[PDB]
Amino acid sequence: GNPLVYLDVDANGKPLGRVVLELKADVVPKTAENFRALCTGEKGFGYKGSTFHRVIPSFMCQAGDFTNHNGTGGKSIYGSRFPDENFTLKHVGPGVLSMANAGPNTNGSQFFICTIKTDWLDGKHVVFGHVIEGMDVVKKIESFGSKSGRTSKKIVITDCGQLS
Ligand SMILES: CC(=O)Nc1cccc(N)c1
Ligand SMILES: CC(=O)Nc1cccc(N)c1
Numbered sequence: 001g002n003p004l005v006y007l008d009v010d011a012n013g014k015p016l017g018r019v020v021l022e023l024k025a026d027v028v029p030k031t032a033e034n035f036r037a038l039c040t041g042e043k044g045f046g047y048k049g050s051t052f053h054r055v056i057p058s059f060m061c062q063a064g065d066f067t068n069h070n071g072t073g074g075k076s077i078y079g080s081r082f083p084d085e086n087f088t089l090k091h092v093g094p095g096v097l098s099m100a101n102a103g104p105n106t107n108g109s110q111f112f113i114c115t116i117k118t119d120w121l122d123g124k125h126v127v128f129g130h131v132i133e134g135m136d137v138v139k140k141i142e143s144f145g146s147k148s149g150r151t152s153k154k155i156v157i158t159d160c161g162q163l164s
């Protein structure tokens with residue numbers, strides 16, 4: 001079946017808990033595989049130790065820039081960037097897992113978890129999974145955001161990997 005992966009998240013060095021994500025490999029195998037491998041760190045790099053650097057309440061929590069930690073960086077397991085696989089899955093509501101980008105065909109490692117339905121992102125960002133468990137943790141992360149996206153606490157993925 002589809003991979004189940006996890007992110008364990010701290011805020012200012014205290015654990016918030018675990019976000020569990022289903023990766024929809026049946027719809028977007030290439031995008032799912034990238035995220036899976038970045039969680040396990042099996043290629044020698046990935047999400048462990050990186051941050052949620054941009055969080056906007058009533059919108060989304062963004063993470064995955066493990067090179068620059070500011071939204072300019074990251075890399076995929078294939079190379080620096082890879083194409084938009086498809087736009088079949090939609091930004092249907094809270095819990096949607098989707099690829100951040102800098103325009104068409106610029107997927108790297110950066111990703112976001114929606115806290116609302118973000119329909120205007122349909123056809124522009126590749127949706128590749130959803131939150132199975134831990135929306136409470138996502139809501140905590142969301143609460144440390146701001147209109148600008150600047151976080152009021154340091155939000156760190158302390159551990160991550162694959163459950164199945
Ligand atoms: C049961 C189920 O699939 N729930 C679901 C589906 C798509 C997106 C989100 N956030 C939650
Ligand atoms: C400058 C740059 O590459 N920015 C950027 C922003 C969001 C996601 C990705 N992959 C890249």
Ligand SMILES: CC(=O)Nc1cccc(N)c1
Binds near residue numbers: 124
């Ligand atoms: C981050 C962002 O704005 N991305 C994006 C992706 C596809 C088309 C357009 N116009 C913009």
Ligand SMILES: CC(=O)Nc1cccc(N)c1
Binds near residue numbers: 062100125
């Ligand atoms: C197309 C567009 O506006 N994309 C976008 C902008 C800010 C944050 C996120 N997640 C996606």
Ligand code: NA
Binds near residue numbers: 001002003004
């Ligand atoms: Na599974």
